[PDB]
Amino acid sequence: NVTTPEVAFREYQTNCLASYISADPDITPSNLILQGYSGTGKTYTLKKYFNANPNLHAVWLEPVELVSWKPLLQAIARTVQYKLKTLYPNIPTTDYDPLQVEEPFLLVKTLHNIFVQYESLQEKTCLFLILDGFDSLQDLDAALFNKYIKLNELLPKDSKINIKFIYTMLETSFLQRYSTHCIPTVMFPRYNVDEVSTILVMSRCGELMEDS
Amino acid sequence: VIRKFTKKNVARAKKKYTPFSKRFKSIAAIPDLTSLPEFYGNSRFENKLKTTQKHQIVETIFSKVKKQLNSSLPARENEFASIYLSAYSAIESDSATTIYVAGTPGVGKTLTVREVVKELLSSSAQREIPDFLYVEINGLKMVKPTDCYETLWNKVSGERLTWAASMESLEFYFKRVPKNKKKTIVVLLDELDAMVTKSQDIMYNFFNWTTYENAKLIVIAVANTMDLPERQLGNKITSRIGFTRIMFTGYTHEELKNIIDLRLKGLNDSFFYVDTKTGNAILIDVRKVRLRMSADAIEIASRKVASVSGDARRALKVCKRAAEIAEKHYMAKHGYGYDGVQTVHITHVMKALNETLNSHVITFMTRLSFTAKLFIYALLNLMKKNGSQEQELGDIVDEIKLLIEVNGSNKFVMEIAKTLFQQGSDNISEQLRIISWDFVLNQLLDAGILFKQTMKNDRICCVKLNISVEEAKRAMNEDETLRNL
Amino acid sequence: DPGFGSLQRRLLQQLYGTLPTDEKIIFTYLQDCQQEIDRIIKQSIIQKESHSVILVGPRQSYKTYLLDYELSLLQQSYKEQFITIRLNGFIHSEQTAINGIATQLEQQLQKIHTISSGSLTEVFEKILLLLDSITKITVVFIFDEIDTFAGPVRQTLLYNLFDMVEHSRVPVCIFGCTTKLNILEYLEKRVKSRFSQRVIYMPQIQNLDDMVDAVRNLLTVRSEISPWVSQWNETLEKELSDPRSNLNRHIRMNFETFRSLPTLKNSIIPLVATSKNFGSLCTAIKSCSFLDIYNKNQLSNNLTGRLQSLSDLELAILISAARVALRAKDGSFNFNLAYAEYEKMIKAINSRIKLWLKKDVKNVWENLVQLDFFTEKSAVGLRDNATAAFYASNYQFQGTMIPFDLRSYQMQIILQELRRIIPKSNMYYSWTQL
Amino acid sequence: NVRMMLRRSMYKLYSAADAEENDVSYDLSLVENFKRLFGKDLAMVFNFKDVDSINFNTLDNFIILLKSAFKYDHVKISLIFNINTNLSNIEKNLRQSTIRLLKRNYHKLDVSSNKGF
Amino acid sequence: IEIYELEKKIGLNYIAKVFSKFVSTRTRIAKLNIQQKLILCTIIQSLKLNSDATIDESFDHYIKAITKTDTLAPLQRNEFLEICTILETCGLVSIKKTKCKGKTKRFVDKIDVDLDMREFYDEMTKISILKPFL
Ligand SMILES: Nc1ncnc2c1ncn2[C@@H]1O[C@H](COP(=O)(O)OP(=O)(O)OP(=O)(O)O)[C@@H](O)[C@H]1O
Ligand SMILES: Nc1ncnc2c1ncn2[C@@H]1O[C@H](COP(=O)(O)OP(=O)(O)OP(=O)(O)O)[C@@H](O)[C@H]1O
Ligand SMILES: Nc1ncnc2c1ncn2[C@@H]1O[C@H](COP(=O)(O)OP(=O)(O)OP(=O)(O)O)[C@@H](O)[C@H]1O
Ligand SMILES: [Mg+2]
Ligand SMILES: [Mg+2]
Ligand SMILES: [Mg+2]
Secondary structure: OOOOOOOOOOHHHHHHHHHHOOOOHHHOOOEEEEEEOOOOOHHHHHHHHHHHOOOOEEEEEOOOOOOOHHHHHHHHHHHHHHHHHHHOOOOOOOOOOHHHOOOHHHHHHHHHHHHOOOOOOOOOEEEEEEEEOHHHOOOOOOOHHHHHHHHHHOOOOOOOEEEEEEEEEOOHHHHHOOHHHOOOEEEEOOOOHHHHHHHHHHHHHHHHHOOO | OOOOOOOOOOOOOOOEOOOHHHOOOOOOOOOOHHHOOOHHHOOOOOOOOEEOOOOOOOOOHHHHHHHHOOOOOOOOOHHHHHHHHHHHHHHHOOOOEEEEEEEOOOOOHHHHHHHHHHHHHHHHHOOOOOOEEEEEEEHHHOOOOOHHHHHHHHHHHOOOEOHHHHHHHHHHHHHOOOHHHOOEEEEEEEOHHHHOOOOOHHHHHHHHHOOOOOOOEEEEEEEOOOOHHHHHOOHHHHHHHOOOEEEEOOOOHHHHHHHHHHHOOOOOOEEEEOOOOOOOOEEOOOOEEEEEEOHHHHHHHHHHHHHHOOOHHHHHHHHHHHHHHHHHHHHHHHOOOOOOEEEEOHHHHHHHHHOOOOOHHHHHHHOOOHHHHHHHHHHHHHHHHOOOOOEEHHHHHHHHHHHHHHOOOOHHHHHHHHHHHHOOOOOOOOOOOOOOHHHHHHHHHHOOOEEEOOOOOOOOOEEEEOOOHHHHHHHHHHOOOOOOO | OHHHHHHHHHHHHHHOOOOOHHHOOOOHHHHHHHHHHHHHHHHHHOOOOOEEEEEEOOOOOOHHHHHHHHHHHHHOOOOOOEEEEEEEOOOOOOOHHHHHHHHHHHHHHHHHOOOOOOOHHHHHHHHHHHHOOOEEOEEEEEEEOHHHOOOOOOOHHHHHHHHHHHOOOOOEEEEEEEOOOOHHHHOOHHHHHHOOOOEEEOOOOOOHHHHHHHHHHHHOOOOOOOOOHHHHHHHHHHHHHOOOOHHHHHHHHHHHHOOOHHHHHHHHHHHHHOOOOHHHHHHHHHHOHHHHHHHHHHOOOOHHHHHOOOOHHHHHHHHHHHHHHHHOOOOEEOHHHHHHHHHHHHHHHHOOOOOOOHHHHHHHHHHHHHOOOEEEOOOOOOOOOHHHHHHHHOOOOHHHOOOHHHOOEEEOOOHHHHHHHOOOOOOOHHHHOO | OHHHHHHHHHHHHHHHHHHHOOOOOOOOHHHHOHHHHHOOOEEEEEEEOOHHHOOHHHHHHHHHHHHHHHHOOOEEEEEEEOOOOOOHHHHOOOOHHHHHHHOOOOOOOOOOOOOOO | OHHHHHHOOOOHHHHHHHHHHOOOHHHHHHOOOHHHHHHHHHHHHHHHHOOOOEHHHHHHHHHHHHHOOOOOOOOOHHHHHHHHHHHHHHOOEEEEEEEOOOOOOOEEEEEEEOOOHHHHHHHHOOOOOOHHHO
């Protein structure tokens, strides 16, 4: 029950996003990876997909602006409960401080404490945590992504809020480090010269209209 | 004010900082600490984990055997006598001493020391010796190694202090306090190697307090190794520990038999009312069933364990595993659930012994895919070609390409080349790596079959076998295709 | 067609395994391991016997799936008999696992009917007072990635956990999960002595019939919740029984390369979901052309696909650098030597095409470094853990203080691989031979 | 490194803004949520001293990191580069994408002690 | 004094019994099975070529010695390790764990041997079938 948008040369990628991202938490994977190099339309296609489906609840994070793992954990704990406040304004909550999160298990504890107070909701829901540029953290090691892979197993199973992680990656070798985890991955290959010309015309002609 | 960072999860215990040397105005002002309410020790969570059963569970005939074989002294009598005589002489002479005990795991060190101090407490209960305080410090049960300072002082005085204040208090208590105002303390230091820090201050302090004239302190130090002080400690601590050290040897098979048959005194060669409707057995529709364990089964278990380790835990677990295997076979044929003569004979013990000894490694590489086994075969060929025990990944890529393109008359290679380089499509271009190349590499890395080096160049990165080459070739010879070429 | 929506939803949640517990799918090759795990957990929870067992198997080999299935099976019939503590070796450290055990203990004991308050010394001795010390509640420990706590320095948590298993009055079940085959050699001698030596190796797929039977279990709808169920089951059985069908060919290819049912599920899910009606789904499962499209997309950012996106100047510079690296004995090159080879090749082509200056070849060089065609000489790259990465970030490397034209680089693709899949009709193909 | 550069920049920004007008995390989300805490927009002037002595890889990565702040309507960023030798010696040390970034609005100003006597 | 009290003037014999109790590779070898004796011979031979070798490198050398001699049935790695663990508990083979020296730095288990080499060659040359394995 999802709307597929029309992206000019990312039609397969858009059908894959429609096949993987839905409001039903039963038929949605815990982790989803979008892999492609710079200017391959990953952000553009993901934004078009979430604009075509306003019922899907998405939280957007830029891991490049956070630099390290501890601000990334605090950013997740801040933005998740801010979105949950603005989504269900009549649900009474407790404002946990995101600076209390200093370790990954503290993030698990804080997310549990946030999610146990939305248990009066009717239907199970999806909260999509989009990490656009995970391997663009200046301070990245090989063990950080394993924590985010296995994070869903520490959160309660029958919760009304079920967090879903969408990762965006640049490097092929970084993604191939984690191939035995069998995460669903959509690849965004580099554009053709014809596709680059079409995108450049369709995105810059109107900007060349009203140049003074 | 604006903070450079925050510590919002600080949890600090309520422990005072003032040591015992400042607790009284003078040495002559210290009272009798034996006549003090909080000194020398003069379980709030045990009701948390209880609930109602709402069921009557089935206890089969083998269940009592499996409960009697749990870890929770016919063979330790000389060691008991030595430890008891030293501790008894130190208690009733108001002397301070160190008793060193070492051994391999599960040879009964902790059990013998605990039974020695139990018999000493029984002796002091009937006024044969002066009364003493018993303290256990396990070095592997401490968060910080300095917490032993916090523990022992809390066991002596009842105070809760920080560790440097606690160790100052213990130094003042052992050194300066007179003997007539004190009590004897027996301290068991279990897992002594865990109490070894960079500067050996804890070991020096604990063994140097035993060289104080007023201390009335007995330290029973339990260690893994006979020459742990000679390997890891300074010469002052090795001098203070002493030359007289007590070795706990591994058990012989007669003693392992004595332990096992002491566990099986009240149910081996005995009758049970079995109630074959459910199988729930009651010790003296319902049958009288004799239960026995074979004496030769205990013989072969005790002989194998006594040759390998002498561990009592290992022997008890082997016999318990044999009883579990027999119980599984028994409940399979009746369908008894959990809610004549049944024997734990030789073959259950042999299946219990061999299930720890059979290796899954060759069985694991047997059931891998073709591409993982082709990786291993190419790595073995490169290892025998250039003689190196470390091969570059690009060499493995070229060796796999060479083995596919050289054995191009093999029917399996004809059938699988398009799969390996194109995924059988004819819309996918020809690939430089095989299909599932990174998958099987990462799989062999998670299994621990391979070691890889941390370089970001994929071609010049090297790979090593972490398993035996003989095991790898024995796995590679089981395959029908790779043993041909 | 709401019936197609119902059938598509049912197929999708069968493929994600999110069925109710009574409808959960256990493959036939997984059944013996499932029974052994069920017997161990039933002897722990029902019969109050303490157990210690490590599950050993590769990633995505149903270690967590079987444990979760067993715990949800015993959840519906013996709910107040047990609590569950979950630890993960990646998330939890040696100090942090104590706090995790304490906080899970209080929130699990508040679910049936403080321990977690204080410093780490107080919390750990309170956990020991609770565990080291009507019916008794079983405490089930699920320890994922238990190999990270069996390290070479000290194994304090594993020591105290196995001591609770072997010498305590509260019955405890400890399940370790790892990928390491030689997990028993990781253990310290006293930790191994307290361990029960009960290791369960997860079953592998042994033959192609196991994969075909598992696919049959996954895609057969065993409930009549759609009117299209019988036709779907008929067409799926027709395709699986036929040895020459496309789906059997894809299963055979997976058996030869990946031998992984999660890998096949990741391709089957968008085939099911991208269909818009029942006949389209039947055509999709009969042809499996989407599986070919998916397989093509999974490789499109590999070394082969990244080379086919290069421009002519990019390809020429890359060929020149591969020539210089082949002639070198350390396989190393810089921007100056690659530009010399490039200008030599352009001169010998135009003597037999625009020559770009070094100022403009700088950009193409930076793009080639960015697309992981070149890499810096003896660069470690991404570090294993956060400590080593932190050490590397506080060091100034010698390859970042010299000018860019003298930095040593090495090729991720050699000139022979460049010759192999650059087409024969390309302009610079003749210079791939040397 | 880039982490310490951003952390010092955000500590200086938060300290100065609270000095002129609760703890936050010293990263670029403070730039994102600046008008939500302080009620007015922001103009940041970065003054890089001794560039010729700086690691140009770290400087390039910090510039590309600051480029992410252009997506916020309330942010204006100025960069000052104190250069001791010449411009070409530093344009050979940055990436070509960084040179294209800096060329959009830049001003050279030759101010030395020995300028025109 | 303690030995006198347990076994019952003191004398010289009790001092000598103190030094006998609280203080040898000929007797350790003599208590072994010929299968166990071959394993010890291969291990000291294994630390001749590599001189920092693992279990799986020592076991690889052991399987080489058998195929050129055909003395006793060749056995499996785990069996090799428990006989090597048998030589732990009688006091000949010593096993440690450290990071290996090489391009890859991860943790391996190794064998070290310090038994007196003068008495090792005397005990093994009496047995004719073990003399190929020196
Ligand atoms: N298919 C497309 N149709 C129209 N415009 C497009 C398309 N793809 C990209 N663009 C334009 O090009 C810009 C760059 O794409 P985008 O930001 O999505 O790239 P990206 O892959 O996310 O890059 P990066 O890794 O640098 O973040 C878009 O913001 C948009 O203006
Ligand atoms: N002589 C014995 N008689 C009966 N049971 C014994 C004997 N020795 C050991 N056991 C059994 O084996 C268990 C292990 O013994 P113990 O805890 O004393 O070992 P340890 O020598 O201190 O070993 P570790 O170095 O592993 O701590 C005991 O709890 C008991 O069940
Ligand atoms: N609770 C669950 N419910 C449904 N499916 C599950 C559940 N847990 C795992 N799976 C599925 O099982 C498959 C792989 O099994 P699983 O996750 O148990 O692997 P594992 O061997 O435990 O992995 P690892 O070693 O990485 O922890 C995947 O398709 C995954 O989605
Ligand atoms: Mg983007
Ligand atoms: Mg002990
Ligand atoms: Mg798992």
